Scaffold this active site. Structure first.
Site, PDB file in Angstrom:
ATOM      1  N   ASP A   1      43.439 -59.287 -64.961  1.00 27.57           N
ATOM      2  CA  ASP A   1      44.384 -59.689 -63.926  1.00 27.57           C
ATOM      3  C   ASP A   1      45.794 -59.778 -64.493  1.00 27.57           C
ATOM      4  O   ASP A   1      46.536 -60.720 -64.206  1.00 27.57           O
ATOM      5  CB  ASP A   1      43.978 -61.038 -63.334  1.00 27.57           C
ATOM      6  CG  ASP A   1      44.811 -61.418 -62.130  1.00 27.57           C
ATOM      7  OD1 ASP A   1      45.402 -60.510 -61.510  1.00 27.57           O
ATOM      8  OD2 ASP A   1      44.871 -62.622 -61.801  1.00 27.57           O
TER       9      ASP A   1
ATOM     10  N   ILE B   1      54.113 -76.224 -62.088  1.00 29.13           N
ATOM     11  CA  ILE B   1      54.726 -74.938 -62.414  1.00 29.13           C
ATOM     12  C   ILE B   1      54.368 -73.793 -61.474  1.00 29.13           C
ATOM     13  O   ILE B   1      55.146 -72.852 -61.300  1.00 29.13           O
ATOM     14  CB  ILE B   1      54.501 -74.566 -63.894  1.00 29.13           C
ATOM     15  CG1 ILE B   1      54.797 -75.767 -64.796  1.00 29.13           C
ATOM     16  CG2 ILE B   1      55.366 -73.376 -64.287  1.00 29.13           C
ATOM     17  CD1 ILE B   1      56.242 -76.234 -64.748  1.00 29.13           C
ATOM     18  N   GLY B   2      53.201 -73.877 -60.847  1.00 31.35           N
ATOM     19  CA  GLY B   2      52.763 -72.833 -59.943  1.00 31.35           C
ATOM     20  C   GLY B   2      51.407 -73.125 -59.345  1.00 31.35           C
ATOM     21  O   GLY B   2      50.674 -73.985 -59.832  1.00 31.35           O
TER      22      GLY B   2
ATOM     23  N   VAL C   1      48.673 -75.057 -61.482  1.00 31.95           N
ATOM     24  CA  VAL C   1      48.951 -75.314 -62.892  1.00 31.95           C
ATOM     25  C   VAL C   1      50.060 -76.346 -63.074  1.00 31.95           C
ATOM     26  O   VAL C   1      51.209 -76.108 -62.699  1.00 31.95           O
ATOM     27  CB  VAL C   1      49.245 -74.018 -63.674  1.00 31.95           C
ATOM     28  CG1 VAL C   1      50.136 -73.100 -62.866  1.00 31.95           C
ATOM     29  CG2 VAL C   1      49.898 -74.346 -65.008  1.00 31.95           C
TER      30      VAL C   1
END
Lengths: 267, 249
Positions: free
Chosen positions: A134, A9-10, A17
């Site tokens: 964050d 996903i990223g 992930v």
């Protein structure tokens, strides 16, 4: 539960992930890993305590935060233990939600609703003594059905060690001014990020953008105006921009909170 | 759990939710364990309590470590030779969670007369945490005790005496199978009840919260008031056998 990948996903701030499937629940999950130092006392205490505090959140069943559902220390060396974090999967973030949203808004009652779940979620977090630190539109996930779920909160300290070896990729357009230490590193930091998300929902590009800390910290004063000592073109309703400044109050101690914000005229 | 306001019971409701997620199985000696028996659990548990007492651990360490022990024993069969290793690893994790200066792997092995070794402990720790899925932030009876106490119109001198007696009852329960059947809330309530009552009995115009405390806490707890009653009487029974643990020698 042994989990098996199904996508990547990223590969943002906290490594790669993967999307995986729970082999008895049939549900999807979002996996992330983290390297931790294997000390003389076994597992690093701050990891144990912080990971445990996130595991416990799931009990509250709050609708605006992603559940951490499983944890496994998988690998293990005399210097390191590899821990995978198993989160509830949410297939799109606030970006994709804002990108596939045609011209021009839209609309306000929907933006108000988003903001209202966002502050609820954050208020929950903050109450339980967890700062996100964050916060990003990427960290802000959106179900089909319009439920905003906050993700990646409380991983700052868990990821401290790994991130100090050695990036550092600092997408900085949302960082509170404080984060550019001194000094803290407290709860208010997330409300600055809220307001920066707040505006950008009516805008369509991160106010205060790239470049380094000084360039980043400079682009903030442009809109807020420099803070005399000792402090060391709206598209929404007039009432809207009222709250936004309160969020974008360069000073933490009198910057609006997620509960005081929730109780704003604009809502 | 620190709100920013005072508009924000909502807390206690959360404690009750958390504790449900950390419940052991009442039938684990039958369905899961093949060697480990309740009297061995008793042995390891009394070992664990003496260590906490000797080390002057945070009060929560012993009940938290037993929650760990009963929870693991609900999920994995353990050989009776490994039980002490398990109990020490439970204390090790419980100490990390609750203490400013946790017990060291080495100090714990010393209490085993060095029958177990640090690397053994370090390896068990990963097994245990992974098996509990790192859900280590469990409630203890002490969490609820202090909560109940904050609702009670007792003077702080009263509260401190209640606290002392109630913490004794908890440690008693934790050595017993009852700690397995009853959630920390129940355990804390029976011990508070047993405490406030015994106290009031010797001081009638004092510790007035004793009156209908069972129903009251039952309502706070959302348990069955006769379950609490049984619980308390099980606690009083358990203390009355504390004069046999006093003269078992």
């Amino acid at each position: 539960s042994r989990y098996e990948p199904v996508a990547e996903i990223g590969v943002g701030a906290y490594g790669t992930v993967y999307k995986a499937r729970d082999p008895h629940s049939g549900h999807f999950v979002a996996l992330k890993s983290v390297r931790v130092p294997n000390g003389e006392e076994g597992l690093p205490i701050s990891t144990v305590r912080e990971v445990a505090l996130l595991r416990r959140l799931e009990a509250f069943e709050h609708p605006n935060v992603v559940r951490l559902m499983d944890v496994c220390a998988t690998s293990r060396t005399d210097r390191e233990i590899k821990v995978t974090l198993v989160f509830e999967h949410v297939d799109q973030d606030l970006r994709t939600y804002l990108d596939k949203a045609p011209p021009p808004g839209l609309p306000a009652e929907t933006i108000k609703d988003l903001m209202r779940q966002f502050l609820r979620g954050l208020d929950f977090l903050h109450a339980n003594c967890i700062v996100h630190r964050d916060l990003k539109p990427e960290n802000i996930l959106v179900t089909s059905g319009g439920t905003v779920k906050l993700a990646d909160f409380g991983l700052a300290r868990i990821y401290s060690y790994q991130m100090a070896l050695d990036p550092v990729v600092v997408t900085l357009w949302y960082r509170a001014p404080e984060v550019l230490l001194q000094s803290t590193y407290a709860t208010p930091v997330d409300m600055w990020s809220v307001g920066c998300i707040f505006a950008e929902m009516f805008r369509r590009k991160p106010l205060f953008c790239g470049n380094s800390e000084a360039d980043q910290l400079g682009k903030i004063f442009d809109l807020i105006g420099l803070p005399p000592e000792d402090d060391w073109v709206p598209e929404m309703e007039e009432s809207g921009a009222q709250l936004l400044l309160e969020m974008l109050t360069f000073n933490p101690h009198k910057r609006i909170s997620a509960f005081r914000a929730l109780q704003h005229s604009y809502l | 759990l620190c709100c920013e306001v005072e508009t924000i019971d909502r807390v206690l409701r959360a404690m009750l939710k958390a504790e449900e997620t950390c419940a052991p199985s009442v039938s684990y000696f039958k369905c899961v364990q093949k060697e480990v028996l309740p009297s061995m659990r008793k042995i390891v548990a009394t070992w664990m309590l003496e260590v906490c007492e000797e080390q002057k651990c945070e009060e929560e360490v012993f009940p938290l470590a037993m929650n760990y022990l009963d929870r693991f024993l609900s999920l994995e069969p353990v050989k009776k030779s490994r039980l002490q290793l398990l109990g020490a690893t439970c204390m090790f994790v419980a100490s990390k969670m609750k203490e400013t200066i946790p017990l060291t792997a080495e100090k714990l092995c010393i209490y085993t007369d060095n029958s177990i070794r640090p690397e053994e402990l370090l390896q068990m720790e990963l097994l245990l945490v992974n098996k509990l899925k790192w859900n280590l932030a469990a409630m203890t009876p002490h969490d609820f005790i202090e909560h109940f106490l904050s609702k009670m119109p007792e003077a702080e001198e009263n509260k401190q005496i209640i606290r002392k007696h109630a913490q004794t009852f908890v440690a008693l329960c934790a050595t017993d199978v009852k700690f397995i059947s009853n959630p920390p809330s129940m355990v804390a309530a029976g011990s508070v009840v047993a405490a406030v009552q015994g106290l009031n009995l010797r001081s009638p115009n004092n510790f007035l919260s004793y009156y209908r405390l069972t129903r009251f806490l039952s309502r706070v707890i959302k348990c069955d008031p006769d379950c609490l009653r049984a619980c308390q009487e099980q606690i009083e029974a358990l203390l009355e056998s504390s004069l046999r643990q006093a003269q078992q020698n």
